Amino acid sequence: HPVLEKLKAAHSYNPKEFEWNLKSGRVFIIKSYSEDDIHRSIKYSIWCSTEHGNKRLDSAFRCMSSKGPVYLLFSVNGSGHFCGVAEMKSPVDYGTSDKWKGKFDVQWIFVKDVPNNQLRHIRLENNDNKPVTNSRDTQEVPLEKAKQVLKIISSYKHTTSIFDDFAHYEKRQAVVEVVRKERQSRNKQ
């Protein structure tokens, strides 16, 4: 599969060393609606949250302007694992450019399944001491606990990725586009 080979050659997924001991920065949970959205995000380096989520992330990125990075810890709802880590790279663009209303740039860094039981011992004092694995979308992670999460995700010797199913997602999306196009045609009549 050529798209995945292009993506892996052009970007440096799952670096073997990663500075997790962040001197500055902000870290947030991302809860995706689906694997398809993750696949689309890795392929096109974009993300979109809800309206509320986008406002929070836009504000954080703009407040971090030159001081340090904004990291996104991805997990699809009800999945039982995190699927990767990406860096936020731009503010939110609301201009007209069809399922996502805004968008911002991300750089996917880790694409690897890290099970939730590797992280449940880390709790968020700013979210009623619940496990970081029980977070809502765009929940901010305090820097020290974020260091621990990034260290575990960075080091974890994973068995699978969403990449293991790349062709599957490529086909799903392709079939969807045909389905949409023909349906749209039946409604043009």
Q: Is 100 annotated as a binding residue?
A: yes
Q: Which CA distances in Å does 7 have to 43, 44, 100, 170?
A: 7, 10, 22, 14
Query: In units of Å, what resolution does this entry have?
Result: 2.5
Domain for residue 50, yes or no?
Answer: yes
Kindly report the number of other CB atoms within 10 A of residue 14's CB atom.
19
Residue 179 lies in a domain: no
94 assigned ligand-binding residue: no
Does the annotation place 127 within a ligand binding site?
no
Contact 48, 102 (CB under 8 A): yes
In eight-state DSSP terms, residue 93 is B
Classify residue 18 as left (phi > 0), alpha (psi -120 to 50) or beta. Answer: beta
113 belongs to a structural domain: yes
Domain assignment of residue 117, yes or no: yes
- Length of the chain, in residues: 189
Separation of alpha carbons 44 and 38, rounded Å:
10
Annotated ligand binding at 113? The verdict is no
This entry's atomic model was obtained through X-ray
Parallel/antiparallel/unpaired status of strands 46-47 and 81-88: unpaired
Residue 24: which region, alpha, beta or left (left: phi > 0; alpha: psi -120 to 50)?
Answer: beta
- Residue 71 has phi, psi (to 5 degrees) of -110, 145
Distance CA 26, CA 142 (A): 8
Instruction: Give 176's contacts (C-beta < 8 A, 6+ positions apart).
Output: none
Q: Answer whether 104's CB lies under 8 Å from 93's CB.
A: yes
Q: Is residue 28 part of a domain?
A: yes
77 is in an annotated binding site: yes
Q: Cα separation of 186 and 92, whole Å?
A: 35
Instruction: Look at residue 84 and tell me if it is in a domain.
Output: yes
Q: Is residue 12 part of a domain?
A: no
Rg, the chain, Cα only: 17
Query: Which of 134, 183, 153, 35 is CA-nearest to residue 86?
Result: 153
Known binder of ligand: residue 101?
Answer: no
Distance CA 108, CA 88 (A): 9
Domain limits for position 119: 18-157
End-to-end CA distance of the chain: 38
- Nearest CA-CA partner of 116 in 131, 136, 105, 130: 131
Query: Is residue 177 a part of any domain in this protein?
Result: no
The domain tally of the chain equals 1
Q: CA-CA distance, 6 to 170, in Å (whole number)?
A: 14
Beta strand 26-32 with 140-141: parallel, antiparallel or unpaired? antiparallel
